[PDB]
Design a protein around this nucleic acid. Sequence first.
RNA 1: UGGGCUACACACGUGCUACAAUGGACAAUACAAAGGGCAGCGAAACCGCGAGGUCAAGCAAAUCCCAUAAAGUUGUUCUCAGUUCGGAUUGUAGUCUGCAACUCGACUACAUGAAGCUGGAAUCGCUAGUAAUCGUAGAUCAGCAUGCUACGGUGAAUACGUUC
Lengths: 113, 176, 80, 60, 77
Amino acid sequence: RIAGVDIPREKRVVISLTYIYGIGTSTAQKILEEANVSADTRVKDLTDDELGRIREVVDGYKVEGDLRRETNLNIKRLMEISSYRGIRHRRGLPVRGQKTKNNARTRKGPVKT
Amino acid sequence: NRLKEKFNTEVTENLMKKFNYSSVMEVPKIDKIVVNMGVGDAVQNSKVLDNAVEELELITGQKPLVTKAKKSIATFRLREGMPIGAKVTLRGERMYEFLDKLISVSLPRVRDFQGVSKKAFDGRGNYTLGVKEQLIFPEIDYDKVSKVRGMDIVIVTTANTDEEARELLANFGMPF
Amino acid sequence: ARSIKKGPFVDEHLMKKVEAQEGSEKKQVIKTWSRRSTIFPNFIGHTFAVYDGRKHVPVYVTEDMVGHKLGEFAPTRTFK
Amino acid sequence: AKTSMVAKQQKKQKYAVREYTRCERCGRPHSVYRKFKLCRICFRELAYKGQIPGVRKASW
Amino acid sequence: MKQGIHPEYHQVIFLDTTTNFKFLSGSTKTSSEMMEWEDGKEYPVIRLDISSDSHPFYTGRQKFAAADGRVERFNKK
RNA sequence: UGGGCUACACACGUGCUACAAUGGACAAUACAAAGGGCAGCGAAACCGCGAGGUCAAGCAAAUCCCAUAAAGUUGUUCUCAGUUCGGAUUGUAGUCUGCAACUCGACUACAUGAAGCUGGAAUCGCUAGUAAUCGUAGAUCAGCAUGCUACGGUGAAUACGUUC
Ligand SMILES: [Zn+2]
């Protein structure tokens, strides 16, 4: 349990740390190298000092709920300023200049024939 | 009661000297402040009115009175007695606190603010200010605002003339 | 342009028109076709009538609008 | 192509990125080869006439 | 007033951070932070981005951008 | 000059990417062919994790460069899980071209990590260096290719027969 979130017990530490929101593979490797810990050692077979060092490194990366709040604040700011990206966020359409005549399902939801 | 102290000390003297009152009892004072929100769409969704009442209560500090239709209107699909508004009356310390807050914390938060109408006087020394976004007020978080709606703030004063109401409000700090 | 090594782009005519009458507090609306001009802090509090293709949409500049283009606030297509 | 358009292509452009190629024989804007300054149609016609040095039908 | 119907109401110090200007008045915002006031009693503080002494229309002067803002990051760029 | 041609409740054709263990990730190490290069191909070196930036050799070509091919082979790891699959979606921060990437470019770093767990009726290509897979190059072109046109690497299955 790191950053208030449980991580798979039987998964290697490097992979299991990716389950933390805001932690991917690159940041997981970087954290693991900063807080010296075997790459292949599973979290279940881990030492309390290693866990404490990992927590110490993680706490300052600005992950999880803080990251979510920052992203939501950015999205809300661009919605509020009445930007083009904000209008597209409100309408649930692609924001990064895709074509909506086809292949916009991940933004427009399921097909409504 | 900073605003009340200001009125007792500076505004009283300034206004009395300006208007040549033979007695202090003629000095106008702010009798009350009535914050009204007319929710016509409560006809279609009472929940709108409930949220509006909650927001007004948070703004003012006291439960508002729910105002109901005085008469039935076919065009509005309005039946007599249906709650279609909320109102709060503020007097004394609560009034003064709300007034200074409205002048200092709330009003400047208006986008592209350029002052409030100087002609918005009923003609007898009472001033009505139509705010257009509840988000102006600091007590409301835009996250919880399901809809944005305006308010009417009626400052009812004992002044007999719009000139004296303007002088009193300006001394208090109303932009124009 | 976009690259940091180059300064944020803005039309010289637009920038000089904004700078003109800076001291006076009776700032007026500035007609502009430059949808591509970036919004500098100098633009805060100004009104730009930005051409969107057929008409000049008025745009009021605030602090949160700094760093974006003037075209991002004058939509070009109409839907529903 | 339009004569005015050909003229506007010949004239100097205030931009430099604003320069585009047109077939110099007919004026077609699309499918113009750089080596010949010809569109595919004119290239085919002149290759048939044998007036493009060293250009012949290919096969393999 | 009647008991149990009105929302909880208490004194708060609104603080315009731009000018670090403090004003005391009642409200229901109820910020955790507490700051001392000239009267011996402490009351909580409500942070405020823009106030009467800081809004350009009230003040007659151009407003000053705050730290960590869009303008600050743009100038840092 | 600016905006359409890039819209978006929808239906269809053609493709790219996948749904995984005949695989994913990591490190090491081989084997092609065919084209392009003048204000164009930009070697080595230094800087940045990165796309890229500074200096800059050679080269108007069997000489130099683009340009280290990938699949593959050998070792470690995952162990059948919507996952170490898959990469759409969007936040922030960069690079490059262009007077200018908002509408409306490509790519890069970090995070986010949707559907999808071999697809109903139906329907398509192909008889051999063919199909299928793997990359490579070029025309247009400042920049922009999952399209088009060529190149090679590995390399199948089946054809009884003319009833429909
Ligand atoms: Zn031609």
